[PDB]
């Protein structure tokens, strides 16, 4: 359902073949809602069967009127917050299963993972503000000019959220490394 | 695989029937790695079939009580030693925010206010869990401490606390992010 919503959002930037959709998805919205080539391809086919997409041969998918309607309905609805599935938090809760040295290794890897995430998110923000990110560029060319500021600002906001979470994860792991000094 | 690791960790606090495991899981490790009753029951059956768990029929009708075998203790230690694999992000609120232009700024403010309320509630839950952990009376923690050498008790508790401090850290970051989004929406 949520993968469908992310595909509707992606396809509102313009029509795409399944292969191109898979490529553009992973370079854009896949950073906040991941989807692989084996998930995207059958969902696109299902959305076409449910008449949310129109298929045209160039096999290239475009939103139908029902697809635009489904996009707007999906966004209007409140977020349904799923339960937490955090492998690093699970690991940390049971660090006593291993050594303090193991725990430091895990916490250092946590820091490195989210420091890399921060670099990736900040680079994405640079491309969004430069308006040259390929999916954003297509979106802007097909969007009213009065909407461009909001369109870019909300993409930036999403990646600022990735950065905020990453920073909290880094400082949490730093506090854990200090905890390990004592016990 | 990760659900199996969470169940091994839970059952290292002591043997449990599947029903008791289900209830205890949801009030302990389920707050960091969620597991439904329909996910937990078949995973325990599989773990017993693979001899990571010993099943013993107990009066409860009889029910199967699951306990770690030596193979299960080895699987638990091995699972913890391996590096974490960081899955790809699937964050519904971040996805919503990325495409707030689908609706009105009023819709977006409603979403962001809901984000704040969700994580302020999670902070209360996490802080209450830390109180129960430090009091040593959380039911799974108490069972675990009963079966653990005294020299390890402070370490055991501290790591549970550390996990929920991470839940609080994340929740606070989500609140601060949503609050800056609300300020953005003032100007857009
Ligand atoms: C949500 O992430 C993105 C979305 C878009 C888009 O759909 O225009 C472009 C770049 C992104 O990084
Ligand atoms: C990981 O979350 C918890 C774990 C335990 C435990 O296994 O002893 C107890 C309480 C918890 O909140």
Numbering used by the authors:
A (entry chain A): 1 to 58, 68 to 192
B (entry chain B): 1 to 60, 66 to 67, 67A, 68 to 192
Quote the passages of the study that discuss this structure, keeping the authors' original sentences.
VanR belongs to the PadR family of regulatory proteins and has been proved to specifically respond to its effetor vanillic acid, a hydroxytyrosol analog. In the absence of vanillic acid, the VanR protein binds to a 28-bp operator sequence downstream of +1 position of the PvanABK promoter and represses the transcription of the vanABK operon. When vanillic acid is present, it binds to the VanR protein, inducing a conformational change which releases the promoter DNA, thus activating the operon transcription.
To facilitate VanR engineering, we determined the crystal structure of VanR complexed with vanillic acid. Electronic densities of vanillic acids were found in the interface of two subunits. Specifically, the carboxyl group of vanillic acid is electrostatically stabilized by salt bridges with R148 of subunit A and by hydrogen bond with the side chain of Y103 of subunit B. Furthermore, the hydroxyl and methoxyl groups on the benzene ring of vanillic acid form two hydrogen bonds with the side chains from Y168 of subunit A. Those three residues were highly conserved in different bacteria, suggesting they are essential for ligand recognition. To alter the effector specificity of VanR, amino acid residues Y103, R148, and Y168, were chosen for simultaneous site-saturation mutagenesis. The sequencing results revealed amino acid substitutions (Y103L, R148L and Y168M) in HyT12.
